Homo-oligomer: A and B are copies of this chain.
């Protein structure tokens, strides 16, 4: 799996909002309020069982500002289904 830096544009911001919505359902922090995704944003492209360079899915690692704190969110996106899941929502973490 190859890591790359990605932009913190609307698509990335919406992943941050998804992470905070998923973290609110888990409830470890009580109700968080999404502010913004900050740099750096990174994306890993995960390859399936090697039989074409076929794409399995993507992992995003985001720094998410919510409720005056910073969190590290790890999100998985399935290439075939386009379904997303929150892998990890941890913090507060110090800024990069």
* Interface residues, chain A, with chain B CB atoms under 8 Å away: 2-5, 39-40, 42, 44, 59, 61, 72, 74, 88, 90, 93-94, 96
Starting from the known contacts A3-B40, A88-B94, 17 additional A-B residue pairs (CB-CB under 8 Å) come to: A2-B5, A3-B5, A3-B96, A4-B5, A5-B5, A5-B42, A40-B42, A40-B44, A40-B61, A42-B42, A42-B96, A44-B96, A59-B96, A72-B93, A74-B94, A74-B96, A90-B94
Complex: A94 Cα to B90 Cα, angstroms: 9
Cβ-closest chain B residue relative to A87: B94
- The reply to whether B3 and A61 form a contact with Cβ atoms under 8 Å apart is no
Q: Could you say which residues of chain B place their CB within 8 Å of the CB of A61?
A: 40, 96
